[PDB]
Symmetry: D2
Subunit: 114 residues, 4 copies
């Protein structure tokens, strides 16, 4: 199944934050309406924050996370969770190798803000 | 029900990251085995990362998040989600007022690392 | 924090199914737009299905689950989880006593149907 | 990533319940420690509860859900969510065709029981 794709409420600000846990340099692209809206990159084996930004979901609300390492897309896993019918998390893990820890880039999207 | 309390695997590193979305200064305390192990404070209405840290869950695995604004405890919500039977997120929202957006401090705990 | 309240897309059919795990008889009420739409009753300590039904979320999309045991409101826990940006679960547990297993009535709402 | 595989508490009873939403007849197989422990089947476009059973997770706790329609494996999506650090849901969706509603067989595993 498709992973890393989320429909947010239209025209809504959201946070996006990426963490790295791998030998390899992670590039995380955040798409809004099928165009790149932000790109983060970095390398850490200690969960460093490699980027964080506030974006608008735009007219369609379609947000997609893609991760590439060493020139190839990582395999993604994702889900959305909503707490007390108010607080939204869109969560992404990714695997760049063979160990299947799925933490090589971890991406957290949260909304609403403010 | 109790919120903001999670049992992690023992002696395991985890990440903890706090975001703020309120006019009030947030104080986030992260307790491991009932003792404060990290503290973050700050004011943002735009999802600032008021702190991120790597901690060790220690012998007990017990991790608790508390949030307050100038000493008044915020009301918490929380849950844990596991992706592909491997990747863990422990999620906390908090409310410091009456609007019930539950984003006033947001805390994400993730493991494994590395 | 309020629990057991979910906003569904408007005018959408959804399933609601309840299970019991308690010596007490569980009564589960399901409200749509603040009006009772289904009621299930039963007793089991073996996870029996005490009711299942299909409802429509109507113009507001507001769905609420309440649980009581001999008229005493149970404390609730809840969350919503969306897989592949398509499949929705609204999940409720409830506690009628002191052991805090929160399984005394378990309610699963799922959509879309069909 | 692998989907539909969950590590449960060892030696512990859990509920497993399947719902159908497709023109195709669903077959759901539940494996405990790699051996078939339950099979459910039916055909509904209105969320029929085609099976529900209590199983024991056995010595290893490994539980796997597979879904097929007329002998062809469906694509699976899954996650586990934990409420108040104790109430667990392992969730599976599946797709037998091209519309990507992932509801064609829906499986919910819940524990603890009793
Ligand atoms: C006098 O005293 C004081 O200072 C005050 N008053 N009122 N207030 C309020 O509070 C609240 C709670 O905290 C707040 O809210 C917050 O923030 C906002 C922005 C949002 O975010 C929400 O959500 C939160 O909760 C408000 O703001 C305030 N107001 C004013 C006017 O300040 C305080
Ligand atoms: C006379 O009075 C009466 O009835 C009583 N007492 N006590 N009790 C109790 O309660 C409780 C609460 O509800 C119960 O718990 C329940 O169930 C069980 C089995 C389990 O499940 C739990 O979790 C729940 O919560 C109990 O059982 C009882 N006990 C007796 C002996 O009965 C009542
Ligand atoms: C002749 O051939 C046959 O058999 C067929 N064709 N087409 N089909 C289709 O398929 C599909 C897949 O499976 C189906 O889908 C299902 O169901 C529906 C109702 C819904 O639920 C969905 O989601 C699912 O997936 C369809 O139905 C069909 N169509 C017709 C018309 O049949 C088969
Ligand atoms: C240090 C290692 O780097 C890459 O091989 C990752 O895929 C592994 O998960 C691990 O983080
Ligand atoms: Ca890896
Ligand atoms: Ca890694
Ligand atoms: Ca607030
Ligand atoms: Ca706020
Ligand atoms: Ca109980
Ligand atoms: Ca019980
Ligand atoms: Ca389908
Ligand atoms: Ca279907």
């Amino acid at each position: 199944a498709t992973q890393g794709v989320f429909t947010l409420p239209a025209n809504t600000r959201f946070g996006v934050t990426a963490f790295a846990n791998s030998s390899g340099t992670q590039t995380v692209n955040v798409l809004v309406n099928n165009e790149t809206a932000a790109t983060f990159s970095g390398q850490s084996t200690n969960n460093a924050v490699i980027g964080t930004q506030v974006l608008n979901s735009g007219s369609s609300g379609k947000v997609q996370v893609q991760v590439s390492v060493n020139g190839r897309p990582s395999d993604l896993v994702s889900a959305q969770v909503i707490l007390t019918n108010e607080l939204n998390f869109a969560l992404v893990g990714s695997e760049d190798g063979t160990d299947n820890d799925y933490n090589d880039a971890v991406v957290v999207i949260n909304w609403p803000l403010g």
